[PDB]
Amino acid sequence: TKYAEGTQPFTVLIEGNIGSGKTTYLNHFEKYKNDICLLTEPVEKWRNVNGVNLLELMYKDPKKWAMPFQSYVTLTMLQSHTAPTNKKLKIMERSIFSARYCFVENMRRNGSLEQGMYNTLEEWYKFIEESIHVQADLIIYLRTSPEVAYERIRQRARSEESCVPLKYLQELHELHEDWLIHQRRPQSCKVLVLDAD
Amino acid sequence: TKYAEGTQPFTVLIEGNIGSGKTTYLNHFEKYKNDICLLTEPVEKWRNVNGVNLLELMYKDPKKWAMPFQSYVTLTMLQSHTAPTNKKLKIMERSIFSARYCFVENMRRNGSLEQGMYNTLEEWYKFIEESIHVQADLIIYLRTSPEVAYERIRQRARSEESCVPLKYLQELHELHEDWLIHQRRPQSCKVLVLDADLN
Amino acid sequence: TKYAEGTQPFTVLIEGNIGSGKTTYLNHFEKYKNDICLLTEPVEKWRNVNGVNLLELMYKDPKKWAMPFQSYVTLTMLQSHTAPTNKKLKIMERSIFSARYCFVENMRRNGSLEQGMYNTLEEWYKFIEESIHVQADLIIYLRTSPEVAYERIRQRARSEESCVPLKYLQELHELHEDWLIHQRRPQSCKVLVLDADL
Amino acid sequence: TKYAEGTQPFTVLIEGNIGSGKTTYLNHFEKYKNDICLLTEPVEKWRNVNGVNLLELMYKDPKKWAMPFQSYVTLTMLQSHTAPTNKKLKIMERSIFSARYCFVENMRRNGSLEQGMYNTLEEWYKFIEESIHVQADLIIYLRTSPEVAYERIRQRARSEESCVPLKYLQELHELHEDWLIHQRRPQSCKVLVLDADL
Ligand SMILES: Nc1ccn([C@H]2C[C@H](O)[C@@H](COP(=O)(O)OP(=O)(O)OP(=O)(O)O)O2)c(=O)n1
Ligand SMILES: Nc1ccn([C@H]2C[C@H](O)[C@@H](COP(=O)(O)OP(=O)(O)OP(=O)(O)O)O2)c(=O)n1
Ligand SMILES: Nc1ccn([C@H]2C[C@H](O)[C@@H](COP(=O)(O)OP(=O)(O)OP(=O)(O)O)O2)c(=O)n1
Ligand SMILES: Nc1ccn([C@H]2C[C@H](O)[C@@H](COP(=O)(O)OP(=O)(O)OP(=O)(O)O)O2)c(=O)n1
Numbered sequence: 001t002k003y004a005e006g007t008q009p010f011t012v013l014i015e016g017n018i019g020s021g022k023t024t025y026l027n028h029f030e031k032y033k034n035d036i037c038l039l040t041e042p043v044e045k046w047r048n049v050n051g052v053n054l055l056e057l058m059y060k061d062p063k064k065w066a067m068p069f070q071s072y073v074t075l076t077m078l079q080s081h082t083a084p085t086n087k088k089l090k091i092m093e094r095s096i097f098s099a100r101y102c103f104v105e106n107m108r109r110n111g112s113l114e115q116g117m118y119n120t121l122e123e124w125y126k127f128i129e130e131s132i133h134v135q136a137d138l139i140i141y142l143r144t145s146p147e148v149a150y151e152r153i154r155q156r157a158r159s160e161e162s163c164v165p166l167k168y169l170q171e172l173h174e175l176h177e178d179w180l181i182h183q184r185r186p187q188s189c190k191v192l193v194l195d196a197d
Numbered sequence: 198t199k200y201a202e203g204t205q206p207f208t209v210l211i212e213g214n215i216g217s218g219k220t221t222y223l224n225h226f227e228k229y230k231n232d233i234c235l236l237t238e239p240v241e242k243w244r245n246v247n248g249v250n251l252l253e254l255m256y257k258d259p260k261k262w263a264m265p266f267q268s269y270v271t272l273t274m275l276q277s278h279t280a281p282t283n284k285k286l287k288i289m290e291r292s293i294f295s296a297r298y299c300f301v302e303n304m305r306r307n308g309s310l311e312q313g314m315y316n317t318l319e320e321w322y323k324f325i326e327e328s329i330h331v332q333a334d335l336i337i338y339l340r341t342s343p344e345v346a347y348e349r350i351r352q353r354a355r356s357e358e359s360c361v362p363l364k365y366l367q368e369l370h371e372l373h374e375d376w377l378i379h380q381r382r383p384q385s386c387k388v389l390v391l392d393a394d395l396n
Numbered sequence: 397t398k399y400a401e402g403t404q405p406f407t408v409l410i411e412g413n414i415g416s417g418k419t420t421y422l423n424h425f426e427k428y429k430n431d432i433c434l435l436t437e438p439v440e441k442w443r444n445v446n447g448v449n450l451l452e453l454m455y456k457d458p459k460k461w462a463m464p465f466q467s468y469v470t471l472t473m474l475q476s477h478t479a480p481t482n483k484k485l486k487i488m489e490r491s492i493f494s495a496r497y498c499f500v501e502n503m504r505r506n507g508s509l510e511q512g513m514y515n516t517l518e519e520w521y522k523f524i525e526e527s528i529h530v531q532a533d534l535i536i537y538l539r540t541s542p543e544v545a546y547e548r549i550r551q552r553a554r555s556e557e558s559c560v561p562l563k564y565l566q567e568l569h570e571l572h573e574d575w576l577i578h579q580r581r582p583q584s585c586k587v588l589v590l591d592a593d594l
Numbered sequence: 595t596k597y598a599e600g601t602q603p604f605t606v607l608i609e610g611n612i613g614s615g616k617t618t619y620l621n622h623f624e625k626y627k628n629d630i631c632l633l634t635e636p637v638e639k640w641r642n643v644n645g646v647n648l649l650e651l652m653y654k655d656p657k658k659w660a661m662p663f664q665s666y667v668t669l670t671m672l673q674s675h676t677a678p679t680n681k682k683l684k685i686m687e688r689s690i691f692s693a694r695y696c697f698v699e700n701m702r703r704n705g706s707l708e709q710g711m712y713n714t715l716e717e718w719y720k721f722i723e724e725s726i727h728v729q730a731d732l733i734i735y736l737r738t739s740p741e742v743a744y745e746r747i748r749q750r751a752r753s754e755e756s757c758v759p760l761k762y763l764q765e766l767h768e769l770h771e772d773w774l775i776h777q778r779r780p781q782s783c784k785v786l787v788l789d790a791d792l
Contacts, residue, residue, distance in 0.1 A: 003200045003328040033579060041580060049320070050518075050644040051504070051511040052313035065313075068264050072317045075324060082328065116249040116262070120269045123246070127272055131200040131279065132328060305645065312645040319644075380627050381635060399597045399725040445717070448710035464661045464714045471718055478725065512646040516662045519643070520669055527597040527676065528725060 004082035008135035009037070011081075012091040015098055015180065016142030017173050018164070019152030020196045022093045025142060029091060037085040039092045045076050047160070056160045062112035070107065070121060073099050074128075081134045096134060100125050101185045102175040109171070136189045141180045142196035146170040201279035205332035206234070208278075208287040212295055212377065213339030214369050215358075216349035217393050219290050222339060226288060234287040236277040243270060244357070252357045259309035267304070267318060270296045271325075278331045293331060297322050298382050299372040306368070333386045338377045339393035343367040400478035404531035405433070407486040411494055411576065412538030413568050414560070415548035416592050418489045421538060425487060433481040436489040441472050443556070452556045458508035466503070466517060469495045470524075477530045492530060496521050497581050498571040505567070532585045537576045538592035542566045598676035602729035603631065605675075605684040609692055609774060610736030611767050612755070613746035614790050616687050619736060623685060631679040633686040639670050641754070650754045656706035664701070664715060667693045668722075675728045690728060694719050695779045696769040703765070730783045735774040736790035740764040 014022045026040045046055045049072060058069035077096040104121050107113040113121070128134075146169040153161055153169070178184040180191055211219045223237045243252045246269060255266035274293040301318050304310045310318070325331075343366040350358055350366070375381045377388050410418045419437040426434070442451045445468060454465035473492040500517050503509040509517070524530075542565045549557055549565070575581045577589070608616045620634045640649045643666060652663035671690040698715055701707040707715070722728075740763040747755055747763070772778040774785050 001198070001200070001202075003198075027578060030577070030579065033584070038579070040578075044580065048504075049313060049316050051514060052316055054313050054317070057313055064261050067268075068314045068317045071264075071268060072320065075317070075321055078328075079324060116246065116251055116254060117265045119246045119249055120251070120265045120272070123269070124272055127276060131275075305642075315645055378624070379621060379634075380624060380632065381638070385627070397595065397597070399595070445710060445713045448713055450710050450714070453710060460658050461710075463665075464711045467661075467665060468714045468717070471714070471721055474725075475721065512643060512648050512651055512659070513662045515643050515646055516648070516666045516669070519666070523669060523672065527672075 002131055002133040004135075005133040007084060008082075008133065009085065009088050009090050010137045011135040012089070012138045012140060013095040013097070013136055014091065014093050014140050014142065015095065015176065016196060017144055017146070017149040017169060017176055018161075019149045019156065020142040020144045021152070022142060025140075025196075026091065026093055035087055035089065037083070037087040037090040039080045039083065039090070042073075042076050042080065042093060046073060053160070059160050059163060062107065063114070066107050066112045067117040067121065070099060070104050070113070071124075073103075074121075074124065078128070078132060078134075082132060090135070095136065095139075096125075096128070097136075097179070097185075097187055098176070101179045101187075102172055106168075106171050106175055110168075136187070139180065139189060139191045141176070141191055141193045143176075143180075143193050144173070144196045146173045148197050149173070199328055199330040201332070202330040204279075204281060205330065206282060206285050206287050207334045208289065208332040209335045209337060210292040210294070210333055211288065211290050211337045211339065212292065212373065213393060214341055214343070214346040214366060214373055215361075216346040216353065216366075217339040217341045218349070219339060222337070222393075223288060223290055232284060232286065234280070234282040234284045236280065236287070236289040239270070239273050239277070239291060242273050250357070256357050256360065259304065260311070263304050263309045264314040264318070267296055267301050267310070268321070270300070271318075271321065275325065275329060275331075279329065287332070292333065292336075293322075293325070294333070294376070294382070294384050295373070298376045298384070299369055303365075303368050303372055307365075333384070336377060336386060336388045338373070338388055338390045340373075340377075340390050341370070341393045343370045345394045346370070398527055398529035400480075400531075401529035403478075403480060404529065405481060405484050405486055406533045407488065407531040409491045409493075409532060409535045410487065410489050410538065411491065411535050411572065412592060413540055413542070413545040413565055413572055414557070415545040415552065415565075416538040416540045417548070418538060421536070421590075421592075422487060422489055431483060431485065433479070433483045433486040435476040435479065435487070438469070438472050438476070438490055442469060449556070455556050455559060458503065459510070462503045462508040463513040463517070466495055466500050466509075467520075469499070470517075470520070474524065474528060474530075478528060486531070491532070491535075492521075492524070493532075493575070493581075493583055494572070497575045497583075498568055502564075502567050502571060532583070535576060535585060535587045537572070537587055537589050539572075539576075539589050540569075540592045542569045544593045545569070596725055596727040598729075599727040601676075601678060602727065603679060603682050603684050604731045605686065605729040606732045606734060607689040607691070607730055608685065608687050608734050608736065609689065609770065610790060611738055611740070611743040611763060611770055612758075613743045613750065613763075614736040614738045615746070616736055619734075619790075620685065620687055629681060629683065631677070631681040631684040633674045633677065633684070635687060636667075636670050636674065640667060647754070653754050653757065656701065657708070660701050660706045661711040661715065664693055664698050664707075665718075667697070668715070668718070672722070672726060676726065684729070689730065689733075690719075690722070691730070691733075691773070691779070691781055692770070695773045695781070696766055700762075700765050700769055704762075730781075732784050732786060733774060734786045734788060735770070736788050737770075737774075738767070738790045740767045742791050743767065 023041050047053045054069045057065040080092050108118040149169050150166045213219050220238050244250050251266045254262040277289050305315045347363045347366050412418050422436045443449050450465045453461040476488050504514045545565050546562045576587050617635050641647045648663045651659040674686050702712045744760050744763050
């Protein structure tokens with residue numbers, strides 16, 4: 001018996017690469033706010049943790065800050081996944097899944113998370129599977145080419161992201177592909193693929 | 198309802214400074230392993246996580262490795278706190294409480310955990326309070342003086358602890374006192390204070 | 397049970413950027429003062445606190461004065477939110493919510509409020525939520541474009557606001573939108589969006 | 595009805611100058627924790643506001659930091675004053691009253707709080723007075739001489755307090771006296787005077 005078990009409605013997760021337009025997509029559901037629990041733009045949380053901008057720290061110094069950043073992401077996802085609601089539908093930008101299967105895996109591959117950090121995160125992930133209910137009935141996948149995602153990143157010009165190369169978006173694209181198209185992860189619910197190009 | 202709620206027996210937590218003799222104290226319950234759930238010596242997990250020595254890394258490079266270390270410690274305690282058991286008594290060495298109120302706080306004060314690392318841990322702690330049941334019926338506090346703790350640490354001579362100064366033990370001591378004697382933490386359960394300075 | 401809880405009639409909040417025409421819009425209800433509790437334009441209070449002009453001090457030296465300024469705003473908002481009335485309707489210019497979600501947040505982002513100052517405001521907001529009932533049934537959002545709000549500010553020529561750039565209104569605009577259109581903020585009640593570009 | 599009205603046990607406030615021994619005195623009630631709501635040593639909060647040491651910022655730069663410092667002290671006192679409890683006795687170290695009648699007043703008199711900052715804090719106090727219930731049935735005054743207070747402060751050697759002059763303890767002593775001995779403040783409940791020079 002996990003925390004939040006039996007307390008959650010049908011849940012949609014909006015996934016896709018950086019700059020795939022997840023927030024822009026979720027904005028369309030604004031009029032329906034009375035019947036949908038909408039939990040959007042988690043990134044504003046990660047830029048302001050009682051004043052501290054973890055996102056900024058992460059990109060500057062990933063070998064020191066990537067583990068607390070991803071730890072804090074994991075938490076905010078958990079807080080959203082388990083938030084109470086009397087509404088019959090919940091829709092969320094991202095999830096604990098993209099953190100684990102995409103961004104944490106990529107940061108291990110590129111070396112920003114050393115084994116000890118990766119290990120600590122994965123052991124947390126495993127304990128979270130045992131202890132906390134994560135409701136997920138549909139994933140909407142906003143699929144893009146790495147190049148379109150990079151354009152939207154350059155256009156948006158978030159300062160924290162000023163040094164993000166195309167290769168990093170290519171790496172992240174393949175991981176989203178591995179999970180959402182090629183069924184290479186143990187999760188595990190329905191997926192609707194949308195062309196966001 | 199929280200995870201592990203209603204699943205846990207009377208639970209005793211053995212607390213005290215580094216080198217206070219917590220494992221030794223818990224050792225004397227071994228002969229009753231079949232009547233008691235004993236979860237002892239968590240430091241052994243921290244020294245080998247799929248081969249990685251987080252304790253050693255923390256001590257060598259706290260500013261990089263203190264956050265992931267405490268985050269792993271928090272996990273191992275939660276793993277122990279929520280462990281299912283068919284016995285009427287559980288006794289554990291340490292708790293999530295001393296990682297939070299003593300070690301994480303001291304690493305904050307000393308600069309080992311930057312403010313965004315500390316805030317991340319604190320935010321995790323608040324969410325753990327909401328989501329995970331931590332059974333705590335009695336705390337046994339092996340109260341020592343920092344000098345006695347320090348001597349036992351030098352005797353034991355763990356390579357990881359080779360550079361630990363007495364000042365750190367004094368800091369840790371006052372924090373255990375603030376929590377277990379002076380009831381300065383929101384945590385409240387019965388405390389039994391033993392003199393752990395003798396033989 | 398909170399202070400003012402169950403004491404308040406249906407309550408409307410008028411919100412919008414600086415210069416968006418909140419007091420003007422509220423002036424239309426003047427003739428109905430006897431059936432409506434009308435609380436406008438709070439800036440008159442911030443310009444004269446027993447003779448101290450805090451709005452002017454804040455613009456001149458924000459690193460020292462932004463914090464007691466927003467603290468006073470918060471207080472005058474609470475005074476209005478909880479002000480007693482035997483009328484069936486209350487209408488108010490601004491609210492505690494815009495101070496928190498728009499003005500305090502922007503002063504944090506621009507450095508006017510150092511961290512300890514922002515933390516202190518936020519912790520107060522958390523306590524106020526626990527202790528004080530803030531009736532909020534409808535927000536009327538006077539939606540303007542930054543350039544239109546800026547022109548009105550220049551036309552008006554309050555001396556306190558003489559150094560306010562267009563950029564600042566652009567930041568405040570995005571924060572009103574984030575709150576009132578995109579509902580990124582915890583507080584929810586119905587919002588009526590009006591075009592106040594004229 | 596004010597917030598927390600009717601929810602509070604008989605409440606004892608422990609007051610005295612800096613270094614008068616309030617925490618030490620309160621330590622004596624530790625064994626009775628299960629029957630007494632004990633709220634001690636609030637200075638640990640003022641030193642770690644999500645990692646920010648407001649106490650240190652105030653002493654370093656009082657003209658900038660004294661206002662948010664006292665604003666936060668006031669909050670913490672309110673959080674304690676209104677904390678729920680099933681216990682039949684509540685004992686708190688310090689109170690909102692001493693922030694207002696002693697420390698805020700002295701920082702006004704020495705210039706650390708300029709008029710508009712002081713005005714903001716006082717207007718808040720008046721609102722708090724109307725909206726929040728503060729239970730206070732007995733004040734225990736640990737009376738000292740400024741010299742004993744000053745010696746204890748030097749001996750404790752808190753880094754934040756290293757530049758604290760004797761004059762400042764003299765000023766604070768007289769304000770506590772004004773309030774707790776000479777009945778100069780609007781507030782009244784019973785006062786128990788104790789010689790803490792011992
Ligand atoms: N587990 C995660 C999640 C996000 N990020 C980073 C990548 C970006 O720098 C920033 C925001 O990325 P998202 O794709 O989550 O949010 P966007 O605002 O980019 O999404 P969109 O533009 O699609 O609305 O956070 C990260 O490092 N690890
Ligand atoms: N939250 C924690 C818990 C422990 N430690 C460190 C301090 C020591 O370097 C090591 C083990 O300390 P403990 O007091 O937990 O265990 P001991 O085996 O030293 O206890 P005893 O000697 O009393 O059996 O881990 C830490 O940094 N953070
Ligand atoms: N929490 C707040 C509220 C207002 N202000 C500032 C912005 C202006 O300099 C002045 C008043 O702005 P308002 O938008 O509240 O009032 P106006 O009178 O400008 O509104 P309108 O022109 O729409 O009537 O106070 C501030 O710094 N912080
Ligand atoms: N409204 C207040 C209350 C306290 N302080 C400051 C003065 C000291 O620098 C510090 C702590 O003082 P207290 O007298 O409240 O606490 P102590 O711990 O010194 O009390 P004691 O030593 O008597 O237990 O906070 C302040 O500036 N304003």
